[PDB]
Structure formats: structure tokens, C-alpha cells
Amino acid sequence: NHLSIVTLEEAPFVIVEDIDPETCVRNTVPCRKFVKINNSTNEGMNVKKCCKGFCIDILKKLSRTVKFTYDLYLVTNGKHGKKVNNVWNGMIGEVVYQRAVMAVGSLTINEERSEVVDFSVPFVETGISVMVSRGTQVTGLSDKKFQRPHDYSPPFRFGTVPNGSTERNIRNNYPYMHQYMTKFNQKGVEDALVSLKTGKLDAFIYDAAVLNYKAGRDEGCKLVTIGSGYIFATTGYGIALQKGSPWKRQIDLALLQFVGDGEMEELETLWLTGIC
């Protein structure tokens, strides 16, 4: 009934805030982050941070509906999820190695992850999108500028934020594009939006739902998602749960109720809608 639940920051899905100068106020839920004392010890401390966002509003709704309480924590070993020598890290990892009953955030459902964890029904449509400055000419991932980057002189500059579903999808389908992209690996989304706006990168390949949110909220509406916000290798954001979990049913039916009720379209109006 009192479940360990992992999350990861990614505006607007999960937003971390520092606790008030005493406790967590408004729509915010408390969320602990284990912070190391130093980088040559395992000794650390659980800092009390304050979590909010679209997924946090889904989790807030789910505890009420499904009737559970939770101990919310932020993933420190990695990010979303990556298989390293057949050993999982990030949110996925936390659920696999029974450190979390479930993972709520901007976590992309994919076959690879569905072999190890059970996913709730999708709550946000996602996949791969291509953001450029308003004026770059790209048909999609299918572009010879991407498929064959050395056919063009000078070559096209494009990258992603590695160790996530996007990089796995590109590695899986386009081996030549992948090996080319690696030299343009971005630390995170903010670096890539700057590398884009400051002309240091010609296109940033990333998660559809985050790229679509970033376009709509762009200062001066210079950055855009190719097509009219076209998604390739279409998937969604799902709640990760342990294989054979008893919560799956209860969570799926609640999520399906929230879609039907209009409670989900409400969440999209509050958190995801943009200007541009």
C-alpha cells in the first residue's frame, strides 16, 4: 500500500524544486534525492526536494483513484533506462532490481524495456521528432542528409542525448547514421537547444513529446519540429511496473478512465499547451 516509486526530472513531465525556507507547497509532492557527500565514497544523504509536473499530476490522481500511498525518489543511477552488459540502469533499472514498485515520468515504452518490465497503458504520445531552426530542409529521418551524411559537403550536423530510447531506435535501424551522430552527442536538451540557436548544430533528434513542448514554448518561435510536429517510431509514455505486478490492472483502468473523463485533456491544457 505504501509503494517505493522512482521518477526523473524532465520539464514539463517532472519538475524538481528545492524545499521552502519548511515543507512542500501547492501541487508539489515531496521527493527525495540521494546526494553523495563526496565522489570517492558511497556515503550520501537524502535531500528533501519538491516534485511537480504532468506525470506528478498523473501519480497524484493514481494514488487517490487506485488507493495507495508512496515514497517518491529521484533516480541517481543513470536516467530513463539503458542496458549495459545486460544490466539495466535508470528508472527501468530501479523497477527491474526491485528498488521501485513503479516508475512515473517521461519514460518511453519500447520492445527492449517491455521484455524486462510491464508498462501501463500510454498516457502521452511520443516517439522521435527532429527539431531545426525555422528554415532547415529535412523530409524526416529518411533524408539522405541523415541516412548518408558524408554524401553532402560540408556534412550535416545532427545529434541526440545518448542512452535513451531515441539512440536505441537509431542504433537499431540506421547503423551508418548512428556511427556518424555519436560525435554530436548532447549532454541534455538545453545544451542541444543552445547548440541549435547558436548555429553550432543543424538538427537535434530527440523524444517527440519533449521536442513538441519545446517548440511551442520557444522564445521568438525560432526552433521547430519537422513536418508539423511529425513523430517517427510512434510510441508513448507509460508507467513502468514490475513483471507480473498486481497494480497493472488498477492503474490501466484508472488511466483509461482519466482519458475518457477529460482529466487527461485537462492535464495537457495545464502543462503541455504552448504559444507558437
Binding site: 515504452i109 520492445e111 508498462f119 500510454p122 517517427f232 517510431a233 483509461l256
Partner: protein, 286 residues
């Protein structure tokens, strides 16, 4: 003896096209836009389309998005199947008999008549309480199909939010769109008008919008948006009120539920699902 999967489906263009077998009982060799051969299965459905009539089962030619996807799920997971059409031509709703029962494909799946539903079956709370759905193989919504000339803002036109006789609108009886209006209070004045005019089939309502014997049709956009591209005399109005996805139906006991979703994801990821969409769903202009 059998491990041969009973596959219930419905007729719904461009997902499942149903046509007669030839005189030898075989399927016509048809070729796609590309020039590649159209994959076709035999489907043992009835012939008398009339309600409360004797169902005489006859082999027919089944092909479309959902057939390509079934052939895929078959090859991939290694299983054999027999395709048959839903005896009552319905998707599935739960009706009062005290005791309640499901009609259409939903009834068929739950009764044992079918071991899996390969069709454009909308995922919803009602159905999901009783059956297991796969991860979606399509995300679409609901929209209004009208004759070119009929002017409507969308789902909130005065001719729809406040009904009459000058403007007659409806949906398909015993479907998810039926359930949708039947469970929402804000649409109570809409459903009470619509239940008076609801159609036994989508084909029938789309025909009635062609005949001008119907003014507007609230149905699945993947189907409606397609019919408009095929029939330039018909047009879709407004954006999408409500968004829903299609899933493969199975029983909660079915040991295929995992492997079905793993294939649907494999297919999305590797662009085969976009391939199917590019083949069937997105073609023609007006």
C-alpha cells in the same frame, strides 16, 4: 485437434476489406500501389446481413491493414489461424439481459467463439475490465463526416448540441462511440437524439450520408478521414473531439498477450506500422 487461432474480425475499410471468393473458392490476385501483391486470407462469415435472421456461414476474401498486421503477428510469433467475421456485425458493448452480456467481437472473444480480435477495436475502460488489449497499433480519434456543402463548426455546432429533425446525426449501434455518448452527461441531449437514428454498420451510415438520408456521422477518424479521400463528395468537419487508439483483443488467460505487444512495438520501432499506414490509410486527395 487444434492450436489454430480463431480470429474474429469486422468489415471496416481500410482495415478489413471483405469481398467474395472466386468460383473455385480462392482469392483474386490483386497488387498494391507499389506493385507488390496484396496479402489475402479466407474469412468464414455469414451472408444474410438482416437482424434476427438465419446466419449461413460462407467463405469470403479478407484483406487490409488488420490482415497484414495479423499475417505479421502470425509469422513473428509462429502460430496458425482461421479468420471469421463477427456473426452479428458488431464491435461490442455490454447490454442488460439483471445479468449483463457483451455483443459483437467482445461477446465472441469472451464466449470462446474467437481466441483473438484483429480489427480496428477501440481500447476503453469498459472492454478492458473484461478483456486484455495489446499496446496500440494505431492512435486516432473521433470526428464528424458530412456531405460536401453541410456546414458545421465541429462537435459544438448548434445543429448538434441542440438537436431537431432538419439535422439528423448518428453513429454505429453497439460500438465504442455508442458507449462514449451513453456514459457522458454533457452529451445526454446528443445521445437521446442519436439513439433514435443509430446504424447497424459504418458502411450503412457512410451510405446514408451519400444518399442524404443522414446529415452527419460521428465515427473513427482513421476510417472517416479515409472515406473522404476515396469519396470526394463527402468531407470531415472540425478537428478531433476525443482521441483513442486501436488494440488487439485477447482473453485475460491468453498466453500471447506479452508477445502480441512485443511485436506491435517491434513493428512501430522498425517503421513497419508506418509502412502499413502508408499502404492502406494515407492515400488520395480531393
Amino acid at each position: 485437434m487444434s492450436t489454430r487461432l480463431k480470429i474474429v474480425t469486422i468489415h471496416q475499410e481500410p482495415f478489413v476489406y471483405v469481398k467474395p471468393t472466386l468460383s473455385d473458392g480462392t482469392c483474386k490476385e490483386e497488387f498494391t500501389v507499389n506493385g507488390d501483391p496484396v496479402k489475402k486470407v479466407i474469412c468464414t462469415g455469414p451472408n444474410d446481413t438482416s437482424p434476427g435472421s438465419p446466419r449461413h456461414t460462407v467463405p469470403q476474401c479478407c484483406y487490409g491493414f488488420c490482415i497484414d498486421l495479423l499475417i505479421k503477428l502470425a509469422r513473428t510469433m509462429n502460430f496458425t489461424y482461421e479468420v471469421h467475421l463477427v456473426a452479428d456485425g458488431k464491435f461490442g458493448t455490454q447490454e442488460r439481459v439483471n445479468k449483463k452480456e457483451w455483443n459483437g467481437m467482445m461477446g465472441e472473444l469472451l464466449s470462446g467463439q474467437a481466441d483473438m480480435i484483429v480489427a480496428p477495436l477501440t481500447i476503453n475502460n469498459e472492454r478492458a475490465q473484461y478483456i486484455e488489449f495489446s499496446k496500440p497499433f494505431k492512435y486516432q480519434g473521433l470526428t464528424i463526416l458530412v456531405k460536401k456543402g453541410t456546414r458545421i463548426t465541429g462537435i459544438n455546432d448548434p445543429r448538434l448540441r441542440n438537436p431537431s429533425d432538419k439535422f439528423i446525426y448518428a453513429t454505429v449501434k453497439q460500438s465504442s462511440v455508442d458507449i462514449y455518448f451513453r456514459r457522458q452527461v454533457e452529451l445526454s441531449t446528443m445521445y437521446r437524439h442519436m439513439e433514435k437514428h443509430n446504424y447497424e454498420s459504418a458502411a450503412e451510415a457512410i451510405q446514408a450520408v451519400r444518399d442524404n438520408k443522414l446529415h452527419a456521422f460521428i465515427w473513427d477518424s482513421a476510417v472517416l478521414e479515409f472515406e473522404a479521400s476515396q469519396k470526394c463528395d463527402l468531407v470531415t468537419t472540425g478537428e478531433l473531439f476525443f482521441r483513442s487508439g486501436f488494440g488487439i483483443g485477447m482473453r485475460k488467460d491468453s498466453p500471447w498477450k506479452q508477445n502480441v505487444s512485443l511485436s506491435i512495438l517491434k513493428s512501430h520501432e522498425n517503421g513497419f506500422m508506418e509502412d502499413l499506414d502508408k499502404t492502406w490509410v494515407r492515400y488520395q486527395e480531393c
